[PDB]
Design an enzyme around this catalytic site. Structure first.
Site, mmCIF file in Angstrom:
data_model
loop_
_atom_site.group_PDB
_atom_site.id
_atom_site.type_symbol
_atom_site.label_atom_id
_atom_site.label_comp_id
_atom_site.label_asym_id
_atom_site.label_seq_id
_atom_site.Cartn_x
_atom_site.Cartn_y
_atom_site.Cartn_z
ATOM 1 C CE1 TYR C 366 -12.158 32.166 2.893
ATOM 2 C CE2 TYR C 366 -12.084 30.369 1.331
ATOM 3 C CZ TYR C 366 -12.149 31.720 1.604
ATOM 4 O OH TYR C 366 -12.233 32.621 0.560
HETATM 5 C C1 LIG Z 1 -14.526 24.908 9.468
HETATM 6 C C2 LIG Z 1 -14.123 25.609 10.767
HETATM 7 O O1 LIG Z 1 -12.706 25.801 10.785
HETATM 8 P P1 LIG Z 1 -11.745 24.752 11.526
HETATM 9 O O2 LIG Z 1 -11.697 23.488 10.674
HETATM 10 O O3 LIG Z 1 -12.314 24.526 12.909
HETATM 11 O O4 LIG Z 1 -10.427 25.523 11.538
HETATM 12 C C3 LIG Z 1 -14.815 26.958 10.931
HETATM 13 N N1 LIG Z 1 -14.632 27.865 9.815
HETATM 14 C C4 LIG Z 1 -15.595 28.110 8.919
HETATM 15 O O5 LIG Z 1 -16.638 27.476 8.893
HETATM 16 C C5 LIG Z 1 -15.297 29.220 7.947
HETATM 17 C C6 LIG Z 1 -16.555 29.845 7.379
HETATM 18 C C7 LIG Z 1 -16.270 31.167 6.685
HETATM 19 C C8 LIG Z 1 -15.280 31.075 5.527
HETATM 20 C C9 LIG Z 1 -15.715 30.192 4.321
HETATM 21 C C10 LIG Z 1 -16.980 30.756 3.708
HETATM 22 S S1 LIG Z 1 -17.561 29.845 2.246
HETATM 23 C C11 LIG Z 1 -14.299 27.636 12.195
HETATM 24 O O6 LIG Z 1 -13.375 28.489 12.098
HETATM 25 O O7 LIG Z 1 -14.828 27.306 13.293
#
Ligand SMILES: C[C@@H](OP(=O)(O)O)[C@H](NC(=O)CCCCCCS)C(=O)O
Ligand code: F43
Ligand SMILES: C[C@@H](OP(=O)(O)O)[C@H](NC(=O)CCCCCCS)C(=O)O
Ligand SMILES: [Cl-]
Ligand SMILES: [Cl-]
Ligand SMILES: [K+]
Ligand SMILES: [Mg+2]
Ligand SMILES: [Mg+2]
Ligand SMILES: [Mg+2]
Ligand SMILES: [Mg+2]
Ligand SMILES: [Mg+2]
Ligand SMILES: [Mg+2]
Ligand SMILES: [Mg+2]
Ligand SMILES: [Mg+2]
Ligand SMILES: [Mg+2]
Ligand SMILES: [Mg+2]
Ligand SMILES: [Mg+2]
Ligand SMILES: [Mg+2]
Ligand code: NA
Ligand code: NA
Lengths: 248, 548, 442, 442
Positions: C366
């Site tokens: 994710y």
């Molecule tokens: C952590 C962060 O990702 P990066 O480390 O920045 O790639 C963030 N994603 C998330 O928080 C994904 C949340 C949804 C999927 C998991 C649900 S339990 C985002 O895309 O901004």
């Protein structure tokens, strides 16, 4: 002051409009009451509304700039700020949008001027606006066929003239009378009907429009042929360009 | 031959184009218009059904005291009322934006290294093909590992898929061709060789997420959605543990290290995530437009197809909706892609340059800027003076400023082969125009115009940038109609004259060379016409899941 | 001093340096070496002259895979690096012989730049470092080669990238440990948005120095954020001291006792024993074959537990010589110690919570990535108020080569430049020396 | 030393204070009063104790129209302000005799807070001011009334608002002249994101002081942004001196000569005369009945023109006692002067361009507002590098009551607190005095 380069009639007319020592030619007589009616901000005999108390009634602290700058009469009184707005046909109206804003900030005190392609506006204190508006309406700033007083629905600067030589007006505020050859203002500048129309005089004839106009066109005097005016515009472009790079 | 706008002017008005006088006020207002009539009737029905007044022709001022004009979509024989070019009423325009918004480019170079170096498994065209069959099941929203998953309806998401490209021909030819954007097929020989040399042995995915998702959500969804399903497909296709430490390297690579967004995020006052229009730099917009690979022998056509692309996206959808809304900015944009007017002016300038210098052979300096931009500016303004019907057509000063300066700036860049001097010519055009007619645009039109000359060649922090790298978030450009799409054209102009395959990013160029897109980026103006005629078929509709 | 506590200070070899130093001598608000490190981090820029030259030669400017055909400029920047650097320095400095530094590295391929501290004293924030440096080198390059008005904008693009169309310096050929103010998760977060790999690079993978630099940056941010104000101040200072400065040699001694055969669990056992021996905790009551421990000094229990957490990371990830399991150590050290004692874990559960999400986001589809790309500003790892990220720095220092996104991959430019700076590279040395120097002023 | 220029400095009554001061004695990089002003604006916070109390009593927390029924708390905060402020001060200070100030105003309804400068010396940016102040007052209020664990979160909401769910302190009852780092249009912009109305409020509508404060903030930002580095430095310093510090009494004397009956055009005529008399410009060429002027010193021409621009604003908006036309003055002063002379306008067209968009966005449906809500970080008015916004400050100072979104409407809390600070209220005085003091050290 110099005001504007160039050797055409257009260039000279642009300078004349800016020069506060140039006496604008008066072409028509309009009563004080009719200027007020055209503006449409208050009824004749209505007191000037206020936006704040008279300056005398305020208790302002010492400020050398205030002390040195004389307020205009409507500022002393606390008048609302109101406007008058004109549209000028590209078919040789005497005044044109940047001509107006440039001229207004040379000739008039306490002025908020705005230029657009289809409309040009001044906002200032109401009683002062009335005095300026008389001059804007009575003199060669205005032609009643090729210029229009319009606070909204301004379309027309770029349109073909109608068969009477009148600029388009969605709201038909100025009506040409074939019987008199004169134009009447039948609505105020926002488009509300006047109880009694205002005589605006005869349209200028073609010869006189050409004498007085400040627009360059191929079928008048072309800008590209006013080589000294073009030279100065090109100079400003080059000097701005160099300056932004390295201040040379 | 006749000037290119003459046919359109004759269609619009009963008078000949040179005639100075007409008669107004006799057309019945809105009743003259088929489209306004449709709208009046529709407003009555809407109001009756919902119990709230809506469209009413008697509100405010009465439209149609003058002729309500048809517009010719330039390069077509289609004439429509301008309402049919409003982005709300034009499904082609909406889909053009969706197809950009829902695309990202994602490398496989780090992922394959993760596979070979961290997992210790081989990558070949065969394993890549297996991965691509997997990700084309998964990407639209279907499962590959867990039990009891619930999935998207394949027919609602039929527009979502993944292709790849690479500069290595022998590798490209070994991957199953259903999945490959074939550079040699889509580009003429010299452009293909340029693009293949840029890409080299790199392998890149072009990922398109579903239109229905993009519309429900936003542009910043795209790279995330892409990465989730790449991640699942790496797990399934390369037989990995379904969530181990190496899984995070695929995520970081697909979300950050080897992703190319169409647009970068915006500052807070105009807060937006990635893949929104304001983040798309002008050079990318020129590269998204595919005119370059079809119309390469005609640099004017290529440049003006880019202008159309950008005028619509940047003025109608972006400035006219994202950044404002309402009736919006249809005709500020249509001026740049209708009635063959910009085309007339720009062919004039291209021919002037061809004859005097040769394309790309003028000195790249201020002398050329002064020469070309002045000459072309005076030509364009003369046409409005010679043809009263033309002036009444492009009735707003802003429209005229944008058109005249676009021709001047593109022409200057045709001469120098450099977009920066093209840009200088654009600003000089504005200054000349302003002095000639004692007017230019709307109240705020020349903010960037007046900052313009000084900031063309500046090198300071938030001032200096090659035009190709500028975009709608370049500070001076952030607010106003009648510039952004025209700048994309100027960015394209020297590259089209040079015969370059791309303007700013070869990956972006290749990524839209794909007939599986819903919008046909090779013929943007033809597509706008098809949408105007209500003949375009968009993706993303919910008809399958709603009552008949 | 506000607080009564004193600590013994040691060096990175576990040898005593100074006894019974007041705790606040280690405070970011008082310690002149922490001030010097923080001002140094604000003012230091790495300039990649080779990178600028290659970007120009190829017209590859403005971000990944971008290129403008026809804009190429072939300038011998590296061959004239001395002149360019001197010209840039004259623009960067405020006065002659002030604390401006411009030093060439790698045969002129790189430059270390330290923008004068006085510019920051009359600045709101820290962006003067990249912005002053960038324009000084853009101007110096233009002037060195008499680059024309028509071409100079390419030099600007090669140095600072797609800015201002992008918010970031996208494609730039300069680097800082800090990142732009717009990317802060919250106000006061700037010293947290420093990649773990950058810390590990600057400290040359010396485990205790990496832990110290990270702790200094994290806990200094806790003061800027207001978290270390009032009721919480002593907790944060004790955490700085015991988790990141090896106060009382506690981290060192726990690692020594557990390094040969130990586990996270054996470190926990030793830490609980030490806390009991030192009177930090005591048996509050007896359940069935189970002692419930209490404490009259929660901040000190937290600090002891935090030292044990660092030692457990060093033992667990040190034994694997693989950083990935630091997310597991951060989680289960804390989970285990609560059910071992009946006392709250480090940061009252917030390290454990950080660790849950960090584990997920370093082993899932994710987001996240490997340990080295996290930082105190990352959404995954911002939650603990300084007590998690320094362990990640220690773990990455101990990684023998298991990471794709290693400091060698992400932080090479920062390594070459920032590791030159003694205070950045060996902060434990300089902060301890400064604390000893001011000990009788606190 | 770097520049040979000297200027004569005056007070806000047009009286000479000091002759022939070296230009760099006015530099943000050298002038200790500018440093003091900038550090003061970083560190100063207005606390609305009455507002906190009322938000709690009504449970109206978290932003406009928000309320949580059942959460009301009735605490006598203003009645115990002395104790609360003293307790907050103990947490805010670093040491007991440092430069922390906490001063009650309005019978305890408001507090002036100046967070100690030392906290900023070991901070990346400026958010420690609101964050340290907020938590010190939250804690002091909780401690004053022994607010329970269950209720204390309402005190936090009443002080700092919906943060961190919102990025901003949405609904807060503290205020600063600066805004959060995330709202910067670009790195280096923080001293530009200061509402014009706040400047006018702090300076009690004294026109020259408002212009001076605005110019100091704008031109100091130009150094932080790198715009005043190298080739451009002298231009920016001359602009600061002549446009915002009334150097050589040029602004003052132009206003005196044009105040009774003058217009924008008459000011232009006088400025061109003065530039010619002083040898700044000279006739380069004669066209037909038209003199083309040139200059050998573009930075000095720019500065003279900038002084005339300020005087034109004072004359035009002063005569109307209505600020709105400043957008027009900024446009047509510059448009007119180019066609009057053949020389480029102030900031080489950038003031004119700023003015075009500012005019539009203060008279249209699309955004903006009245003059007082703009600032150097506003997308509309960021484009000129310091030469536009100070005129807007002057115009709003001169407004007699024509604005809905006046400083009385937008900036009352700022006014009460920040006008107390002498260097904020009368910066021209302190910056000139400091320049005179260091004049022989340049
Ligand atoms: C952590 C962060 O990702 P990066 O480390 O920045 O790639 C963030 N994603 C998330 O928080 C994904 C949340 C949804 C999927 C998991 C649900 S339990 C985002 O895309 O901004
Ligand atoms: C109220 C404003 C002020 C403002 O902030 N926006 C307005 C109005 C706004 C409305 C008008 C919709 C309506 O009528 O209800 C919209 C459509 C934006 C919206 N809210 O959807 C718009 N303008 Ni305007 N606006 C335009 C233009 C213009 C031109 C029109 C000049 C002429 O002679 O007709 C002038 C500026 C100028 O003089 O240069 C102009 C002014 C103005 N513009 C004046 C109204 C003028 C009037 O009273 O007639 N627009 C244009 O020049 C062409 C494109 C056109 C836009 C719609 C489209 O792109 O299709 C529209 C863009
Ligand atoms: C100026 C700014 O508005 P505010 O002053 O922040 O309300 C900005 N709007 C715009 O730039 C509107 C651009 C589109 C409409 C005008 C086109 S000429 C915005 O909403 O962020
Ligand atoms: Cl404690
Ligand atoms: Cl200079
Ligand atoms: K959407
Ligand atoms: Mg009379
Ligand atoms: Mg032909
Ligand atoms: Mg016909
Ligand atoms: Mg009804
Ligand atoms: Mg196929
Ligand atoms: Mg990044
Ligand atoms: Mg097709
Ligand atoms: Mg020992
Ligand atoms: Mg043991
Ligand atoms: Mg004090
Ligand atoms: Mg209690
Ligand atoms: Mg003479
Ligand atoms: Na109505
Ligand atoms: Na209507």
């Amino acid at each position: 002051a110099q005001y504007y380069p160039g050797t055409t009639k257009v260039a000279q007319n642009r300078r004349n409009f800016c020069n506060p020592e140039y006496e604008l030619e008066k072409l028509r007589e309009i009563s004080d009451e009719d200027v007020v009616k055209i503006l449409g901000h208050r009824a004749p005999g209505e007191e000037y509304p206020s936006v704040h108390p008279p300056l005398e009634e305020m208790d302002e602290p010492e400020d050398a700039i205030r002390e040195m700058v004389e307020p205009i009469d409507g500022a002393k009184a606390g008048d609302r700020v109101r406007y008058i707005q004109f549209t000028d046909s590209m078919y040789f109206a005497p005044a044109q949008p940047y001509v107006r804003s440039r001229a207004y900030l040379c000739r008039y005190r306490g002025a908020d001027a705005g230029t657009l392609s289809g409309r040009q506006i001044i906002e200032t204190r109401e009683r002062d606006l009335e005095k300026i508006s008389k001059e804007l309406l009575e003199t060669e700033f205005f032609d009643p066929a090729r210029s229009g007083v319009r606070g909204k629905s301004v379309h027309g600067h770029s349109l073909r003239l109608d068969e009477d030589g009148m600029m388009f007006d969605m709201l038909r505020r100025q009506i040409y009378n074939k019987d008199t050859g004169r134009v009447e203002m039948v609505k105020n500048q926002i488009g509300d009907e006047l109880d009694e129309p205002v005589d605006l005089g005869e349209p200028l004839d073609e010869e006189t429009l050409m004498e007085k106009t400040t627009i360059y066109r191929v079928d008048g005097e072309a800008y590209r042929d006013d080589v000294e005016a073009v030279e100065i515009m090109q100079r400003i472009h080059v000097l701005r360009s160099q300056g932004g790079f390295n201040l040379e | 031959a006749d000037k290119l706008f003459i046919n359109a002017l004759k269609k619009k008005f009963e008078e000949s184009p040179e005639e100075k006088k007409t008669t107004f006020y006799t057309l019945g207002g809105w009743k003259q218009s088929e489209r306004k009539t449709e709208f009046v009737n529709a407003g009555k029905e809407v109001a009756a059904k919902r119990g709230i007044p809506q469209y009413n022709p008697d509100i405010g001022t009465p439209l149609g005291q003058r002729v309500l004009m048809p517009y010719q979509v330039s390069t077509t024989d289609t004439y429509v009322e301008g309402d049919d070019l409003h982005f709300v009423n034009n499904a082609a325009m909406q889909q053009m934006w969706d197809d950009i918004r829902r695309t990202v480019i994602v490398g496989l170079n780090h992922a394959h290294a993760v596979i070979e170096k961290r997992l210790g498994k081989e990558v070949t065209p065969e394993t890549i093909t297996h991965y691509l069959e997997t990700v084309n099941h998964a990407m639209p929203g279907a499962a590959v590992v867990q039990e009891h998953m619930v999935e998207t309806h394949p027919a609602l998401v039929a527009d979502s898929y993944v292709k790849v490209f690479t500069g290595n021909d022998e590798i490209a030819d070994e991957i199953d061709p259903a999945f490959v954007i074939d550079i040699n097929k889509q580009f003429p020989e010299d452009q293909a060789e340029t693009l293949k040399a840029e890409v080299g042995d790199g392998i890149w995915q072009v990922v398109r997420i579903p239109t229905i998702v993009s519309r429900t959500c936003d542009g910043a969804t795209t790279s995330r959605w892409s990465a989730m399903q790449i991640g699942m497909s790496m797990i399934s296709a390369y037989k990995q543990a379904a969530g181990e430490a190496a899984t995070g390297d695929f995520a970081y690579a697909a979300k950050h290290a080897e992703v190319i967004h169409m647009g970068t995020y915006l500052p807070v006052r105009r807060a937006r995530g990635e893949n929104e229009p304001g983040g798309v730099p002008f050079g990318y917009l020129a590269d998204i437009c595919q005119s370059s690979r079809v119309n390469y022998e005609d640099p004017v056509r290529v440049s003006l197809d880019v202008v159309a692309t950008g005028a619509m996206l940047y003025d109608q959808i972006w400035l006219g909706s994202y950044m404002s809304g309402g009736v919006g900015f249809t005709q500020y944009a249509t001026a740049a892609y209708t009635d063959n007017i910009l085309d007339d002016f720009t062919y004039f300038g291209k021919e002037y340059v061809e004859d005097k210098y040769g394309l790309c052979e003028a000195p790249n300096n201020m002398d050329t800027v002064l020469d070309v931009a002045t000459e072309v500016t005076f030509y364009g303004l003369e046409q409005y003076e010679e043809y009263p019907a033309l002036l009444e057509d492009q009735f707003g000063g802003s429209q005229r400023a944008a058109v005249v300066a676009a021709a001047a700036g593109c022409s200057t860049a045709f001469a120098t082969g450099n977009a920066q001097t093209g840009l200088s010519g654009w600003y000089l055009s504005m200054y000349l125009h302003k002095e000639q007619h004692s007017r230019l645009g709307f109240y705020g039109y020349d903010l960037q115009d007046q900052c313009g000359a000084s900031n063309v060649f500046s090198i300071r922090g938030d001032e200096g940038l090659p035009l190709e790298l500028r975009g709608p978030n370049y500070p001076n450009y952030a607010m106003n109609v009648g510039h952004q799409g025209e700048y994309a054209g100027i960015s394209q102009a020297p590259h089209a004259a040079r015969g370059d395959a791309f303007v700013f990013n070869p990956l972006v160029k290749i990524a839209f060379a794909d007939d599986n897109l819903v919008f046909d980026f090779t013929n943007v103006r033809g597509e706008f016409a098809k949408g105007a005629l209500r003949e375009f078929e968009p993706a993303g509709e919910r008809a399958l899941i709603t009552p008949a | 001093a506000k607080f009564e506590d004193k600590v013994d200070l040691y060096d990175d070899r576990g040898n005593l340096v100074e006894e019974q130093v007041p705790l606040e001598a280690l405070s970011p608000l008082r310690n002149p070496a922490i001030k010097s490190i923080v001002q140094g981090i604000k003012r230091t820029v790495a300039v990649n002259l080779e990178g600028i030259e290659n970007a120009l030669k190829t017209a590859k400017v403005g971000g990944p895979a971008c290129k403008i055909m026809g804009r190429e400029l072939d300038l011998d920047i590296v061959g004239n690096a001395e002149s360019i650097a001197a010209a840039a320095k004259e623009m960067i400095q405020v006065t002659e012989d002030d604390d401006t530094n411009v030093e060439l590295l790698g045969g002129g391929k790189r430059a270390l730049v330290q923008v004068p501290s006085a510019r920051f004293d009359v600045a709101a924030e820290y962006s003067a470092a990249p912005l002053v440096t960038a324009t000084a080198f853009v101007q110096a390059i233009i002037n060195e080669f008499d680059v024309s008005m028509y071409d100079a904008n390419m030099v600007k693009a090669a140095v600072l990238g797609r800015y201002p169309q992008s918010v970031e310096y996208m494609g730039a050929n300069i680097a800082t440990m800090l990142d732009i103010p717009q990317k802060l998760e919250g106000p006061g977060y700037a010293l947290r948005n420093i990649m773990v790999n950058h810390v590990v690079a600057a400290t040359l993978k010396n485990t205790l120095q990496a832990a110290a630099l990270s702790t200094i940056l994290e806990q200094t941010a806790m003061f800027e954020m207001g978290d270390a104000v009032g009721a919480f101040e002593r907790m944060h200072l004790l955490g700085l001291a015991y988790q990141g400065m090896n106060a009382d040699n506690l981290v060192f001694d726990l690692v020594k006792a557990n390094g040969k055969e130990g586990t996270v669990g054996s470190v926990i056992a030793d830490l609980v024993e030490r806390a009991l021996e030192d009177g930090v905790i005591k048996v509050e009551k007896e359940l069935t074959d189970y002692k419930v421990y209490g404490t009259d000094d929660l901040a000190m229990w937290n600090a002891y537990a935090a030292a044990g957490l660092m030692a457990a990371t060093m033992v667990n990830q040190g034994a694997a010589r693989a950083a990935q399991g630091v997310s597991s150590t951060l989680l289960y050290y804390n989970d285990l110690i609560e059910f071992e004692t009946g006392l709250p874990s480090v940061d009252f559960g917030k390290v454990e919570g950080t660790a849950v999400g960090f584990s997920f986001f370093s082993h899932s589809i994710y987001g996240g990535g490997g340990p080295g790309i996290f930082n105190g500003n990352h959404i995954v790892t911002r939650h603990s108020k300084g007590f998690a990220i320094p362990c990640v720095a220690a773990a990455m220092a101990l990684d023998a080569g298991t990471q794709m996104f290693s400091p060698e991959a992400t932080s090479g430019l920062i390594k070459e430049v920032f590791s030159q700076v003694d205070e950045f590279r060996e902060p434990l040395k300089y902060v301890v020396e400064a604390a000893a120097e001011i000990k009788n002023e606190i």
